[PDB]
Design a protein around this ligand. Structure first.
Ligand SMILES: O=C(O)[C@H]1O[C@@H]2O[C@H]3[C@H](O)[C@@H](O)[C@@H](O[C@H]4[C@H](O)[C@@H](O)[C@@H](O[C@H]5[C@H](O)[C@@H](O)[C@@H](O[C@H]6[C@H](O)[C@@H](O)[C@@H](O[C@H]7[C@H](O)[C@@H](O)[C@@H](O[C@H]8[C@H](O)[C@@H](O)[C@@H](O[C@H]1[C@H](O)[C@H]2O)O[C@@H]8CO)O[C@@H]7CO)O[C@@H]6C(=O)O)O[C@@H]5CO)O[C@@H]4CO)O[C@@H]3CO
Ligand SMILES: *[C@H]1CC(=O)N(c2ccc(NNc3ccccc3)cc2)C1=O
Ligand SMILES: [Zn+2]
Ligand SMILES: [Zn+2]
Ligand SMILES: [Zn+2]
Lengths: 274, 274, 274, 274
């Protein structure tokens, strides 16, 4: 029998980390990746399961994610090294039936632990199932080069930042009609910043952090990568245009209304009012 | 018998799309490619043709493309994965006797359909055949990065933009003396955008969609790729000098007038006036 | 038996050169890279050892490096060509028990000689041992594109340069809390530059050569790569922000101390108080 | 301000129970009804809300239904009396932010509590959101007079039972292509019967309990009533024909394929096999 590394999800995880390394958003060990699975998916690969599932408690209870398996990226690992050693960089966990801990059933070899952003990754998983009726399954974080440079010149508010991104290209409005949410500056790695991010996940599928990076979610990896990929391309044009002397002509407010009606999308009221 | 995946026109598609994802042009699902073929080309590959060709009516009758087969890229597909699975992403179609629709013969599995810009393809394919006596065989669309940012700062004029594009490099004038078409901003995926795009093809081989991208048309795949990339290089040259404070010396009109007649080429008279 | 070229350190250094090759940092033959080894790491591979080891005396005595084996690159050797020929581009040397000479054991064939900057690498190799108690093992030098351009604009003072890099990315204060030291411009390849470069290595892990390149040290082959990669990305963001027109809001001094307080890193007082 | 008793959802809950009383399926206090609302629906009626919302703990957590309001019928109430005193027979509940209980805001005066079959209603509400993508909102239970008679004489199996009601009338195929579910006889009002009912709701929108009654689901009250109404009328002609001696000519298996293909409806596999 083929080992678990030949499964459909493991091969998918290599594709995401390999291509992000060529894009240039994951210098050193920046970025994380988590995926949601089903109990039927991992059924044939019971042989690979470790004989000692390590148990790690949860920071706070998550009743909604009871008996839910995930495949995550280990902490302190290089995204470029994932394609070379899947066993030592990845792993699978399963949330207990109570919602206060998980068991490491494979991977994370040599006392490796999941990403330190797990409280942010798990809290946003819960708030997106409710807002999508169990469709979104993937959470991704990356330090988009063109998005970080924007937070130093643009006002740090939800309205104007979302409006600016809509004018970067035509397809931007269609992909994320709900806009993006930007927080004030906060120290990473704390639960106080995970709650704020999870609060903004209730209304948007794209989250911005000033001077740090970006957050996104989607149904599958291909659709999740496309959401971030489209967002960064719009930022690339703006930085190039802004250094030329600033914007001169752009899409009018009424023009975006006509675009929204054709594709059956509802633009954000706050942003369109600008 | 050699598989259809190894044919010359299939190997042409895998080369052209992969060379566009590596240039940062086709984020998400942006981009499509239709190439005209002959009945002799598809004759040896009758074994792999589908036994139940689904019939899909065309929006408008196209008598000039009757009995003319085409190869198309699927709608909503990702240019990164075309090399990974050409059959699920590429397809072949054939126009019926009366020019009212088309049949699916191979590819486009799992209820896949040709690209949503198909009406914009056939309206321009028919016109380009008339202008160049059937030499044209490729239609290319992609989201070049530096090209789009030019529309945000320069006047959206056919003559003005072509004039600037000629001064960016010495080879640009010879490659496209006919100039590049420009259109107002409009909603994609409609037959109205198909008419306007095909209408301007009577006098230009390239059309620029503001804030969206570019439209290509040429005799073969190799020249079509280099037809737009020549304008992309002039844009990258233009972008760098613009941020420097402006352009101070360039090719003068008196230098340009003698250049074309060295090669015996007829320049665009409208741009020569400026 | 297995060739020494199939060991861990030979394959490991092949990665480091090729990765930096595509970044655009090491055109022609610029840049250097050495790694410290152990006697046990090379014990079983005496088969590839040269029968007669050539002897070269050191310019100045180095007592701390006595009887220690190293692996280095060759002078006048491009970083691209290494993967095509491991033997003709690398070499392993072992300093004598006195600290005055070394013998070439394997590699460096065809009268190959180590890099001309060997005094600068050996001087910094010894002095980093005192500071890190033998943890650091790699010294790297390469022409980082965006760090070179910064010295033309920013003043060459430790307090100003360190603060700007800390503000271009959140993680910078955690990666190099000691700051970056700046030297005056000197003629390369001499011994005067080697003594000043080592002088700054007592209080910095990143030393900048104006208009020439950067120096950095790391515990392993990958940590030293990320250290330069993290610092390069920070300078890349600062280049666009400064070129876009200016910098308007920033991370305040109160936030900077709070960020370093959480991760247990002491910022440089002189630059922090700015 | 218009009274809450004249709202669009209270006047719609009277109609559903009054109409079933004239059918005869709700003798004494048999049957109950629940409806899902939105927070905007009950916002204007804040004035009439009780100042001391009673808190009732739930048997088991229901995290998916957090912060969701409903309207239900009381326990031990007569369907005939709802039109006489709406405030004593109906009530408004709201699940808390965690999912372990609910409050009572209006109605159910003189210490009245919701129906004893709420866990069955709540568990089916949660499940049908996943299998339908948030469209089904209503759950109804009633004792069909004839459908009980069919159980005493027909084999208690899912396959033949589904196919027989499919032969009653032509519209039966279109309305419920997924058939009906039949459970082994268990004592009503238990948590075991609630879990078993929810499992069958993952496939079909009609559930049969032997000798007791029926369950239904739909987007609105009118659409939910017509599902059971169509099922009952189809079962009416069955016993009428059956009591005359049995069937003599019925619908062939072939005609079920032709009718389903006409309206783009995929029938059940096992039922169509018979
Ligand atoms: O109404 C309910 O929400 C509840 O409200 C009141 O409770 C408040 C507490 O009095 C108050 O101190 C505070 O609680 C904090 C607590 O002090 C902290 O220590 C921490 O709690 C963590 C806990 O220490 C940790 O062990 C774990 O808890 C799990 C628990 O061990 C495990 O057994 C299970 O709990 C189940 C419980 O055993 C069941 O009986 C039942 O619980 C009922 C309970 O019996 C009812 O009385 C009622 O609780 C009231 C409570 O009485 C009020 O005082 O309702 C409960 C739900 O039906 O079900 C439980 C779930 O299965 O799981 C526990 C967990 O879910 O994993 O984790 C704890 C969280 O990290 O934090 C709490 C919260 O800050 O605040 C309470 C809310 O106001
Ligand atoms: C949300 C859902 C839920 O049930 N929660 C919760 C709160 C408190 C709690 N306390 N448990 C406890 C307290 C003291 C001693 C033993 C157990 C358990 C669960 C939420 O927060
Ligand atoms: Zn980050
Ligand atoms: Zn496009
Ligand atoms: Zn140098």
């Amino acid at each position: 029998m083929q080992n678990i590394t030949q499964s459909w999800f493991v091969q998918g995880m290599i594709k995401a980390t390999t291509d992000a390394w060529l894009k240039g958003w994951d210098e050193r060990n920046g970025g994380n990746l988590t995926l949601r699975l089903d109990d039927a998916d991992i059924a044939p690969y019971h042989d690979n399961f470790h004989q000692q599932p390590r148990y790690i408690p949860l920071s706070q209870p998550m009743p909604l994610l009871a008996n839910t398996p995930f495949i995550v990226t280990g902490s302190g690992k290089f995204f470029r090294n994932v394609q070379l050693d899947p066993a030592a960089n990845l792993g699978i966990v399963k949330v207990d039936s109570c919602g206060a801990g998980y068991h490491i059933l494979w991977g994370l070899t040599n006392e490796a632990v999941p990403t330190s952003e797990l409280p942010a990754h798990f809290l946003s998983h819960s708030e997106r199932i409710k807002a999508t009726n169990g469709k979104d399954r993937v959470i991704m974080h990356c330090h988009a080069t063109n998005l970080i440079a924007l937070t130093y010149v643009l006002e740090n508010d939800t309205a104007v930042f979302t409006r600016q991104l809509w004018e970067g290209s035509t397809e931007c409005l269609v992909v994320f009609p709900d806009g993006v949410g930007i927080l004030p500056w906060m120290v990473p790695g704390t639960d106080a910043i995970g709650q704020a991010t999870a609060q903004e996940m209730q209304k948007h599928s794209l989250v911005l952090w000033p001077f740090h990076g970006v957050f996104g979610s989607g149904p599958t990896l291909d659709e999740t990568f496309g959401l971030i990929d489209t967002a960064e391309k719009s930022a690339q044009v703006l930085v190039k245009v802004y250094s030329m002397g600033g914007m001169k002509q752009t899409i009018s407010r009424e023009e975006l209304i006509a675009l929204g009606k054709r594709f059956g999308v509802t633009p954000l009221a706050s942003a369109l009012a600008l």
